UniProtKB/TrEMBL annotation, chain C:
<keyword id="KW-0346">Stress response</keyword>
<keyword id="KW-0479">Metal-binding</keyword>
<protein>
    <submittedName>
        <fullName>Heat shock protein Hsp20</fullName>
    </submittedName>
</protein>
<dbReference type="InterPro" id="IPR008978">
    <property type="entry name" value="HSP20-like_chaperone"/>
</dbReference>
<feature type="binding site">
    <location>
        <position position="19"/>
    </location>
    <ligand>
        <name>Ca(2+) 2</name>
    </ligand>
</feature>
<dbReference type="InterPro" id="IPR002068">
    <property type="entry name" value="A-crystallin/Hsp20_dom"/>
</dbReference>
<dbReference type="GO" id="GO:0042802">
    <property type="term" value="F:identical protein binding"/>
</dbReference>
<dbReference type="InterPro" id="IPR031107">
    <property type="entry name" value="Small_HSP"/>
</dbReference>
<feature type="binding site">
    <location>
        <position position="23"/>
    </location>
    <ligand>
        <name>Ca(2+) 2</name>
    </ligand>
</feature>
From TrEMBL, chain D:
<protein>
    <submittedName>
        <fullName>Heat shock protein Hsp20</fullName>
    </submittedName>
</protein>
<keyword id="KW-0346">Stress response</keyword>
<feature type="domain" description="SHSP">
    <location>
        <begin position="23"/>
        <end position="119"/>
    </location>
</feature>
<dbReference type="InterPro" id="IPR002068">
    <property type="entry name" value="A-crystallin/Hsp20_dom"/>
</dbReference>
<dbReference type="InterPro" id="IPR031107">
    <property type="entry name" value="Small_HSP"/>
</dbReference>
<dbReference type="GO" id="GO:0042802">
    <property type="term" value="F:identical protein binding"/>
</dbReference>
<comment type="similarity">
    <text>Belongs to the small heat shock protein (HSP20) family.</text>
</comment>
<dbReference type="GO" id="GO:0046872">
    <property type="term" value="F:metal ion binding"/>
</dbReference>
<dbReference type="InterPro" id="IPR008978">
    <property type="entry name" value="HSP20-like_chaperone"/>
</dbReference>
Amino acid sequence: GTMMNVIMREIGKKLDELSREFYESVIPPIDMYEEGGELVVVADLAGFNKDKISVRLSAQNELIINAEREIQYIGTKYATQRPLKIHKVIRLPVKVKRDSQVTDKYENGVLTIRIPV
Amino acid sequence: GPGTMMNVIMREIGKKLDELSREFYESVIPPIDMYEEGGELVVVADLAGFNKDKISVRLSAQNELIINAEREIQYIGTKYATQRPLKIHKVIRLPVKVKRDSQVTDKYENGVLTIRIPVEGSVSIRIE
Amino acid sequence: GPGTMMNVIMREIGKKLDELSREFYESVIPPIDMYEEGGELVVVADLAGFNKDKISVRLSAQNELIINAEREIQYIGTKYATQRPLKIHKVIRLPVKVKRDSQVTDKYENGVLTIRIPVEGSVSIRI
Amino acid sequence: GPGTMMNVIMREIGKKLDELSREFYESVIPPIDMYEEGGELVVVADLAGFNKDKISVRLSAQNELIINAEREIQYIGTKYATQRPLKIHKVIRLPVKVRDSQVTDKYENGVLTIRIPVE
Ligand SMILES: [Cl-]
Ligand SMILES: [Cl-]
Ligand SMILES: [Cl-]
């Protein structure tokens, strides 16, 4: 549910055995700043397909990042921490114009989003 | 009923875990997948936005894999959130015994670091 | 070896504790002094920045004192911290039985709330 | 230094909100509000029951803002609880950059309101 519950779930773990469920809550970390008249969001979101990443602006001034991937490995599996599904809701600091041109770029695993304000 | 400090503390922990800091991500990133097939151990790590030259992989004498990375991120203008990690030091305990002597391959594509490691199926050799 | 998650969580909570939430202070304000003098129980509460009409005081069936208080912080500007409480509900176990028949007096000055509660009591005898 | 607040809070684990220690409130009082309007930055702190003369504020080398206060409390009777803090030392990290400047404080209704002007 909450972050606290997510994080407390991992409380007795070593740092190399954190659950997938935890990374599905915590990924992606996000940088946010405003420069040149637009609001810029930057996400570390490695190893997804561009057609499998969705970005959304809510009525509620929330930025929603969605991503999905499938991962199947041949052989003996020892750790499967990399997240399959991502759902990141970001409340926006400053109001964004309803009609706007929004730019995004996905490179080197990094998702950069530019929203005019 | 006066209520308890315990609940107060719990409630406050919750608030503090609600938004997570860069230092927190520096300690948990990368998440890894780890699997063995055809006498190879593979580690796959989500490690977006680094330069190949700034990443290091080290195999220790304790059968551990060490992933290191560092970057600089420039912030201009008002900055509301700064979660993305600048420095990475992930220590992974390897599930199977691996051959330090043999050749280790890795690659870095789409933010994903992959490390292929030969597994010891024989008698171990130490070259030092 | 590999770090511990626990230490990470500890570190993460610890460094944020210098700034504590409004809800935390709504839980712990006010601190009180309590002492019996002159056949009445005296409760002294550090409760700054309230309007005297917004403070209310009650006495439970379970021999508790309840100190309620409410206020709104209007202040406009670019906020950096919001620690100060808005609503106060504090329930205090009273160490002696109160005479439920008697008038309770409360004074409020310098943010300090003083409450005097007449109590029931008798000289102890061992014949 | 760091982790001191953790220890302060964790010391009251297992207590009812009824019976929190003086030392707790000594570390935790006062709650503050911080916000900038105009050139000055205003700090509103709930610091009931002090004597204005006894209240001291300085600005630090590290640019932390320091609030000091001391007082005595008097009881005639049987004491059941003494939570109210006697000595207050609050170090506040300043968000805006500092250059020693004029500071204005007004202490009314137990509320300390201070204005600091930063460039
Ligand atoms: Cl959605
Ligand atoms: Cl190392
Ligand atoms: Cl000093």
